[PDB]
Design a protein around this nucleic acid. Structure first.
Ligand SMILES: [Co+3]
Ligand SMILES: [Co+3]
Lengths: 248, 248
DNA sequence: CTTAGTT
DNA sequence: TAACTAAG
DNA sequence: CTTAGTT
DNA sequence: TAACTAAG
């Protein structure tokens, strides 16, 4: 009943997330930056047809909305022999002011894992970035032209490929789990963007903790993949390392 | 009468030099080195004809002599639209043990020039290397095949292109002028392989010094170019620098 | 002649 | 990874 | 589509 | 100074 007991925590049975606690972000520009409008490349009818179902959803979910901006970047058809929209935000990235990296690199992250905690739970957050709202004055930065034969659509949430997206989500989630960290000082919580690791002393403290977290997460607005989940094992796969009794 | 007063000091009127004080050198090998015999490349009759007059002289002067060695390197025709023998000692160089560089680089050499000494004399030594005898056990290293349609000829003096030749001549001449340096402490003598610089306080001390040196050199066995000579000036050309009142 | 070393 | 030079 | 960066 | 890749 791991799934039944926490409906709002899993993407499979929680719909879509929304970090309600987090104010919509602004994307500060470089003092030199001016809009760039890149024309849309043509696109096979098949490609454009495989991309419509995504543009349709995110439009109903209010993640995409129409707009009218001087910023415009191209959209892409990419093949898993299926299609999925991919925006080319490289020219926008060049113009966005950089932020200080806070995401610790995986090695130093795992350093702070006491060997005493041998009961692991691993969760990846589903559509992590969309959980973070964009402030309207920043939304025009990622507009893109769309048409199924027109005009511009942009994002209302932190988008795929925005160079600062992983750092910003990290700062957001660390903020939002600050409480949890305090409510459960016997547990060890590891944070790398969207991938989490919870380690405990006993299989008791692990399950009880995995519930406290899965509840904390659903309420706060994020969603985890019930598929790729790994609940209360002594052996889990976190950020490419294998964890078997404290090794790797 | 600069020329008349010192016949044995100038190559023009002193024939050929011979550092009589210096024992014939040995060329120590690398512990790994074994002879290499490189076959002679063909050679236009014109080239070979322009090279015969040199091979003829150095044979009469006893600088070249016949021999029979496992070492053999190629001889070269080079164009000044005239010919002059040039040996390719590169493969022998690879096999000769290196020696510690003692030749100071020109910058640091000129550093020790007191501005008080503004009266210069500059001399280049003619056929410097041939003034140094080779020990017979080392001579076979630079053999080369010669024929005016055969067999090997080698050198009895330090040869053109031997990688250690300039350092060895420097050590030799510094040795041989150690006395002079002491006999004339008011003069400044500068040594770079074959190019010398003598600087003095007065034009008196310069001329008197240039005589003491030109005599010291002739007796010891070296010869200077009376052509390219520069005697008692306040402005001379030494190792590419211009010396005008202590500048450069 | 070959070749050590160069955007 | 495409010759080109100066030097023996 | 483009393009940052690689013996 | 000859493309070739992965990534947006
Ligand atoms: Co160059
Ligand atoms: Co690679």
């Amino acid at each position: 009943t791991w799934l039944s007991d926490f409906p709002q925590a899993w993407a499979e049975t929680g719909g879509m997330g929304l970090a309600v606690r987090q104010a919509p972000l602004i994307i500060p520009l470089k003092a030199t930056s001016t809009p760039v409008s890149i024309k849309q490349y043509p696109m096979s009818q098949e490609a454009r047809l495989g991309i419509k179902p995504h543009i349709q959803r995110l439009l109903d979910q209010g993640i995409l909305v129409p707009c009218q901006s001087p910023w415009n970047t191209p959209l892409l058809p990419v093949k898993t022999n299926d299609y999925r929209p991919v925006q080319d935000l490289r020219e926008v990235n060049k113009r966005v002011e950089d932020i200080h990296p806070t995401v610790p690199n995986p090695y130093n992250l795992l350093s702070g894992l006491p060997p005493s905690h041998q009961w692991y739970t691993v969760l990846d957050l589903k559509d992590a970035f969309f959980c973070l709202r964009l402030h309207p004055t920043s939304q025009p930065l990622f507009a893109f032209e769309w048409r199924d034969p027109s005009g511009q659509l942009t994002w209302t949430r932190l988008p795929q490929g925005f160079k600062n997206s992983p750092t910003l989500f990290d700062e957001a989630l660390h903020r939002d789990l600050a409480d949890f960290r305090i409510q459960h000082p016997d547990l060890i919580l590891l944070q790398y963007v969207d991938d989490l690791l919870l380690a405990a002393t006993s299989e008791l403290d692990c399950q009880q903790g995995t519930r406290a977290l899965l509840q904390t997460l659903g309420n706060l607005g994020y969603r985890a993949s019930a598929k790729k989940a790994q609940i209360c094992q002594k052996q889990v796969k976190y950020l490419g390392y294998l964890l078997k009794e404290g090794q790797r």
